[model samples]
Target chain A: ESEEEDKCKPMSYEEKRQLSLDINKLPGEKLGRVVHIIQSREPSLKNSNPDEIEIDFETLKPSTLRELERYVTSCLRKK
Target chain B: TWRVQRSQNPLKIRLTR
Candidate 1:
Protein backbone atom coordinates (compact mmCIF):
# COMPACT_ATOMS: atom_id res chain seq x y z
CA GLU A 1 0.00 0.00 0.00
CA SER A 2 2.83 2.38 0.75
CA GLU A 3 4.48 1.81 -2.63
CA GLU A 4 1.19 1.94 -4.44
CA GLU A 5 0.32 5.23 -2.75
CA ASP A 6 3.68 6.65 -3.81
CA LYS A 7 3.09 5.64 -7.42
CA CYS A 8 -0.29 7.30 -7.42
CA LYS A 9 1.26 10.63 -6.47
CA PRO A 10 2.15 13.07 -9.20
CA MET A 11 5.56 14.66 -9.50
CA SER A 12 5.95 18.17 -8.12
CA TYR A 13 6.47 21.10 -10.43
CA GLU A 14 10.17 21.35 -9.64
CA GLU A 15 10.78 17.72 -10.46
CA LYS A 16 9.08 17.88 -13.82
CA ARG A 17 10.87 21.15 -14.54
CA GLN A 18 14.24 19.68 -13.74
CA LEU A 19 13.58 16.65 -15.91
CA SER A 20 12.52 18.87 -18.78
CA LEU A 21 15.68 20.92 -18.56
CA ASP A 22 17.97 17.93 -18.19
CA ILE A 23 16.55 16.05 -21.17
CA ASN A 24 16.63 19.19 -23.28
CA LYS A 25 20.39 19.30 -22.81
CA LEU A 26 20.71 16.05 -24.76
CA PRO A 27 21.09 16.06 -28.54
CA GLY A 28 18.05 15.05 -30.58
CA GLU A 29 19.20 11.58 -31.67
CA LYS A 30 20.71 10.67 -28.35
CA LEU A 31 17.65 12.16 -26.68
CA GLY A 32 15.46 9.54 -28.35
CA ARG A 33 17.72 6.75 -27.16
CA VAL A 34 17.85 8.26 -23.70
CA VAL A 35 14.08 8.48 -23.54
CA HIS A 36 13.86 4.88 -24.72
CA ILE A 37 16.23 3.75 -22.00
CA ILE A 38 14.33 5.78 -19.43
CA GLN A 39 11.03 4.27 -20.53
CA SER A 40 12.56 0.78 -20.48
CA ARG A 41 14.52 1.42 -17.28
CA GLU A 42 16.12 -2.02 -17.46
CA PRO A 43 18.28 -3.05 -14.53
CA SER A 44 20.69 -4.70 -17.00
CA LEU A 45 21.51 -1.27 -18.43
CA LYS A 46 23.34 -0.18 -15.29
CA ASN A 47 26.84 1.20 -15.85
CA SER A 48 29.79 2.06 -13.59
CA ASN A 49 29.28 5.84 -13.61
CA PRO A 50 27.62 7.30 -10.56
CA ASP A 51 25.69 9.70 -12.76
CA GLU A 52 23.07 6.94 -12.98
CA ILE A 53 22.87 6.45 -16.73
CA GLU A 54 22.30 3.16 -18.55
CA ILE A 55 23.07 2.29 -22.16
CA ASP A 56 20.83 -0.59 -23.20
CA PHE A 57 21.21 -0.73 -26.94
CA GLU A 58 19.59 -3.72 -28.63
CA THR A 59 22.97 -4.61 -30.17
CA LEU A 60 25.88 -3.09 -28.25
CA LYS A 61 27.56 -1.86 -31.42
CA PRO A 62 30.71 0.22 -31.18
CA SER A 63 29.11 2.98 -33.21
CA THR A 64 26.16 3.28 -30.85
CA LEU A 65 28.37 3.28 -27.80
CA ARG A 66 30.65 5.83 -29.39
CA GLU A 67 27.79 8.18 -29.98
CA LEU A 68 26.53 7.64 -26.48
CA GLU A 69 30.05 8.22 -25.18
CA ARG A 70 30.20 11.57 -26.92
CA TYR A 71 26.87 12.54 -25.49
CA VAL A 72 27.94 11.50 -22.01
CA THR A 73 31.23 13.29 -22.51
CA SER A 74 29.41 16.42 -23.53
CA CYS A 75 27.31 16.26 -20.36
CA LEU A 76 30.47 15.76 -18.28
CA ARG A 77 32.16 18.67 -20.01
CA LYS A 78 29.19 20.87 -19.12
CA LYS A 79 29.52 19.89 -15.52
CA THR B 1 19.14 21.60 -0.74
CA TRP B 2 19.08 18.01 -1.86
CA ARG B 3 15.83 16.63 -3.19
CA VAL B 4 15.18 13.01 -4.06
CA GLN B 5 12.19 10.94 -5.04
CA ARG B 6 12.62 7.17 -5.13
CA SER B 7 9.95 4.88 -6.50
CA GLN B 8 9.95 1.61 -8.43
CA ASN B 9 9.03 2.38 -12.02
CA PRO B 10 10.44 5.86 -12.77
CA LEU B 11 13.84 5.11 -11.16
CA LYS B 12 14.95 8.25 -9.37
CA ILE B 13 18.66 9.07 -9.43
CA ARG B 14 20.36 12.26 -8.31
CA LEU B 15 23.94 13.49 -8.22
CA THR B 16 25.36 16.83 -7.14
CA ARG B 17 28.18 18.46 -5.21
Candidate 2:
Protein backbone atom coordinates (compact mmCIF):
# COMPACT_ATOMS: atom_id res chain seq x y z
CA GLU A 1 0.00 0.00 0.00
CA SER A 2 2.76 2.37 0.98
CA GLU A 3 4.75 1.82 -2.20
CA GLU A 4 1.81 2.28 -4.54
CA GLU A 5 0.87 5.31 -2.50
CA ASP A 6 4.15 6.86 -3.51
CA LYS A 7 3.15 6.60 -7.15
CA CYS A 8 0.96 9.69 -6.82
CA LYS A 9 3.53 11.71 -4.92
CA PRO A 10 4.84 15.09 -6.09
CA MET A 11 7.06 15.18 -9.16
CA SER A 12 10.78 15.54 -9.42
CA TYR A 13 12.52 17.07 -12.42
CA GLU A 14 13.58 13.64 -13.67
CA GLU A 15 10.01 12.44 -13.64
CA LYS A 16 9.07 15.51 -15.65
CA ARG A 17 11.74 14.62 -18.17
CA GLN A 18 10.42 11.11 -18.64
CA LEU A 19 6.89 12.42 -18.95
CA SER A 20 7.97 14.87 -21.64
CA LEU A 21 9.27 12.05 -23.77
CA ASP A 22 6.27 9.79 -23.26
CA ILE A 23 3.44 12.30 -23.49
CA ASN A 24 2.99 11.58 -27.16
CA LYS A 25 2.14 8.00 -26.27
CA LEU A 26 -0.79 9.04 -24.13
CA PRO A 27 -4.30 8.53 -25.52
CA GLY A 28 -6.39 11.57 -26.41
CA GLU A 29 -8.58 11.37 -23.32
CA LYS A 30 -5.63 11.41 -20.98
CA LEU A 31 -3.99 14.07 -23.10
CA GLY A 32 -7.05 16.24 -22.69
CA ARG A 33 -6.93 15.69 -18.97
CA VAL A 34 -3.42 17.08 -19.01
CA VAL A 35 -4.57 20.11 -20.94
CA HIS A 36 -7.33 20.82 -18.44
CA ILE A 37 -4.93 20.76 -15.54
CA ILE A 38 -2.86 23.46 -17.15
CA GLN A 39 -5.86 25.32 -18.48
CA SER A 40 -7.29 25.72 -15.01
CA ARG A 41 -4.02 27.35 -14.05
CA GLU A 42 -3.55 29.54 -17.15
CA PRO A 43 -6.55 30.88 -19.03
CA SER A 44 -5.13 31.98 -22.38
CA LEU A 45 -4.42 28.44 -23.51
CA LYS A 46 -8.14 27.68 -23.77
CA ASN A 47 -8.07 29.43 -27.13
CA SER A 48 -4.75 28.01 -28.28
CA ASN A 49 -4.28 26.21 -31.53
CA PRO A 50 -2.98 22.67 -31.41
CA ASP A 51 0.20 23.71 -33.18
CA GLU A 52 1.00 26.68 -30.96
CA ILE A 53 0.52 25.40 -27.41
CA GLU A 54 3.65 24.56 -25.47
CA ILE A 55 4.00 24.22 -21.71
CA ASP A 56 7.24 24.29 -19.84
CA PHE A 57 6.88 22.43 -16.57
CA GLU A 58 9.53 24.44 -14.81
CA THR A 59 7.58 27.63 -15.42
CA LEU A 60 4.28 26.36 -13.96
CA LYS A 61 3.28 26.87 -10.37
CA PRO A 62 4.32 24.14 -7.96
CA SER A 63 0.65 23.56 -7.19
CA THR A 64 -0.04 22.75 -10.83
CA LEU A 65 3.04 20.57 -10.99
CA ARG A 66 1.79 18.52 -8.08
CA GLU A 67 -1.47 17.82 -9.90
CA LEU A 68 0.47 16.85 -13.00
CA GLU A 69 2.61 14.42 -11.05
CA ARG A 70 -0.28 12.83 -9.25
CA TYR A 71 -2.20 12.26 -12.45
CA VAL A 72 0.88 11.07 -14.32
CA THR A 73 1.57 8.46 -11.68
CA SER A 74 -1.82 6.79 -11.93
CA CYS A 75 -1.90 6.92 -15.71
CA LEU A 76 1.60 5.50 -16.06
CA ARG A 77 1.07 2.82 -13.45
CA LYS A 78 -1.81 1.04 -15.16
CA LYS A 79 0.43 0.02 -18.03
CA THR B 1 26.72 21.94 -26.47
CA TRP B 2 28.92 24.32 -24.51
CA ARG B 3 31.72 22.08 -23.25
CA VAL B 4 29.32 20.44 -20.71
CA GLN B 5 25.71 21.60 -20.29
CA ARG B 6 23.45 23.58 -17.98
CA SER B 7 20.15 22.07 -16.80
CA GLN B 8 18.32 18.73 -16.86
CA ASN B 9 14.54 19.18 -16.71
CA PRO B 10 13.96 18.11 -20.37
CA LEU B 11 10.31 19.16 -20.14
CA LYS B 12 9.50 21.60 -22.90
CA ILE B 13 6.13 19.98 -23.38
CA ARG B 14 4.44 20.61 -26.72
CA LEU B 15 0.85 20.09 -25.66
CA THR B 16 -2.68 20.14 -27.08
CA ARG B 17 -5.24 22.86 -27.72
Candidate 3:
Protein backbone atom coordinates (compact mmCIF):
# COMPACT_ATOMS: atom_id res chain seq x y z
CA GLU A 1 0.00 0.00 0.00
CA SER A 2 1.08 3.59 -0.59
CA GLU A 3 -0.04 4.49 2.93
CA GLU A 4 2.77 2.86 4.93
CA GLU A 5 4.00 6.28 6.11
CA ASP A 6 6.90 7.51 4.04
CA LYS A 7 10.41 7.39 5.42
CA CYS A 8 12.04 10.55 6.75
CA LYS A 9 15.33 11.73 5.30
CA PRO A 10 17.89 14.36 6.22
CA MET A 11 17.90 17.78 4.54
CA SER A 12 19.73 21.08 5.01
CA TYR A 13 17.80 23.42 7.31
CA GLU A 14 18.46 26.48 5.15
CA GLU A 15 17.31 24.64 2.03
CA LYS A 16 14.15 23.53 3.78
CA ARG A 17 13.31 27.06 4.95
CA GLN A 18 14.01 28.53 1.55
CA LEU A 19 11.57 26.11 -0.09
CA SER A 20 8.82 27.02 2.36
CA LEU A 21 9.12 30.71 1.49
CA ASP A 22 8.42 29.89 -2.13
CA ILE A 23 5.34 27.86 -1.24
CA ASN A 24 4.09 30.93 0.67
CA LYS A 25 3.85 32.85 -2.61
CA LEU A 26 1.62 30.30 -4.33
CA PRO A 27 -1.81 31.45 -5.53
CA GLY A 28 -4.90 30.42 -3.60
CA GLU A 29 -6.05 28.03 -6.34
CA LYS A 30 -2.73 26.25 -6.30
CA LEU A 31 -2.54 26.37 -2.53
CA GLY A 32 -5.85 24.57 -2.37
CA ARG A 33 -4.45 21.76 -4.43
CA VAL A 34 -1.25 21.52 -2.42
CA VAL A 35 -3.11 21.70 0.89
CA HIS A 36 -5.35 18.80 -0.08
CA ILE A 37 -2.30 16.63 -0.58
CA ILE A 38 -1.19 17.28 3.00
CA GLN A 39 -4.61 16.69 4.47
CA SER A 40 -4.72 13.29 2.85
CA ARG A 41 -1.35 12.37 4.27
CA GLU A 42 -2.34 13.09 7.86
CA PRO A 43 -5.99 12.52 8.60
CA SER A 44 -5.51 13.51 12.24
CA LEU A 45 -4.62 17.06 11.29
CA LYS A 46 -7.81 19.04 11.31
CA ASN A 47 -8.49 22.79 11.48
CA SER A 48 -5.07 24.42 11.10
CA ASN A 49 -4.11 28.02 11.82
CA PRO A 50 -3.07 29.96 8.75
CA ASP A 51 0.00 31.38 10.47
CA GLU A 52 0.98 27.93 11.66
CA ILE A 53 0.65 25.88 8.52
CA GLU A 54 3.64 23.60 7.90
CA ILE A 55 4.47 22.44 4.39
CA ASP A 56 7.31 20.34 3.03
CA PHE A 57 9.41 22.59 0.79
CA GLU A 58 10.62 19.64 -1.23
CA THR A 59 7.14 19.30 -2.75
CA LEU A 60 6.81 22.85 -4.03
CA LYS A 61 6.88 23.78 -7.71
CA PRO A 62 10.12 24.37 -9.60
CA SER A 63 9.41 28.05 -10.19
CA THR A 64 8.72 28.64 -6.51
CA LEU A 65 11.92 26.77 -5.64
CA ARG A 66 14.02 29.12 -7.75
CA GLU A 67 12.16 32.14 -6.42
CA LEU A 68 12.97 31.08 -2.87
CA GLU A 69 16.71 30.93 -3.57
CA ARG A 70 16.62 34.44 -5.02
CA TYR A 71 14.37 35.70 -2.28
CA VAL A 72 16.78 34.51 0.41
CA THR A 73 19.73 36.02 -1.40
CA SER A 74 18.00 39.41 -1.55
CA CYS A 75 17.11 39.26 2.14
CA LEU A 76 20.76 38.70 3.02
CA ARG A 77 21.78 41.84 1.11
CA LYS A 78 22.15 44.94 3.28
CA LYS A 79 21.53 47.29 0.32
CA THR B 1 1.06 28.91 9.78
CA TRP B 2 -2.13 28.29 7.79
CA ARG B 3 -5.55 26.77 8.32
CA VAL B 4 -6.73 24.34 5.67
CA GLN B 5 -10.33 23.23 5.48
CA ARG B 6 -11.73 21.36 2.52
CA SER B 7 -14.77 19.16 1.89
CA GLN B 8 -14.75 16.64 -0.92
CA ASN B 9 -18.44 15.77 -1.08
CA PRO B 10 -18.21 12.35 0.55
CA LEU B 11 -15.34 13.42 2.79
CA LYS B 12 -14.89 16.46 4.97
CA ILE B 13 -11.44 17.25 6.34
CA ARG B 14 -9.83 20.22 8.09
CA LEU B 15 -6.17 20.42 9.07
CA THR B 16 -3.76 22.83 10.73
CA ARG B 17 0.04 22.65 10.86
Best by lDDT: 2
Docking class of 1: incorrect
lDDT of 1 by residue, A7-75 (tens): 344434354445444545555554555544443344444445433443323333333333334455566
Could you give candidate 3's per-residue lDDT for residues A7-66 as a string of tens digits?
Answer: 433445466454344444555554554555554443443445433333443443333333
The two-chain DockQ for each candidate, comma-separated, is 0.05, 0.27, 0.07
Better model by lDDT, 2 or 3?
2
Worst 10 residues of 2 chain A by lDDT: A1-10
Candidate 2 per-residue lDDT over residues A6-74, each given as its tens digit: 455556777666666555566767777776677666655656454345566667655666676668768
The superposed Cα distance between candidate 3 and the true structure at residue A20, in angstroms, equals 1.1
Report the C-alpha lDDT of model 3 over B1-17, residue by residue, as the tens digit. Answer: 44444333222223344
Clashes of 2: 0
Query: What's the ranking of the predictions by TM-score, best on top?
Result: 2, 3, 1
TM-score of chain A of each: 0.32, 0.62, 0.44
What are the lDDT scores of the predictions, listed in order?
Answer: 0.41, 0.59, 0.42
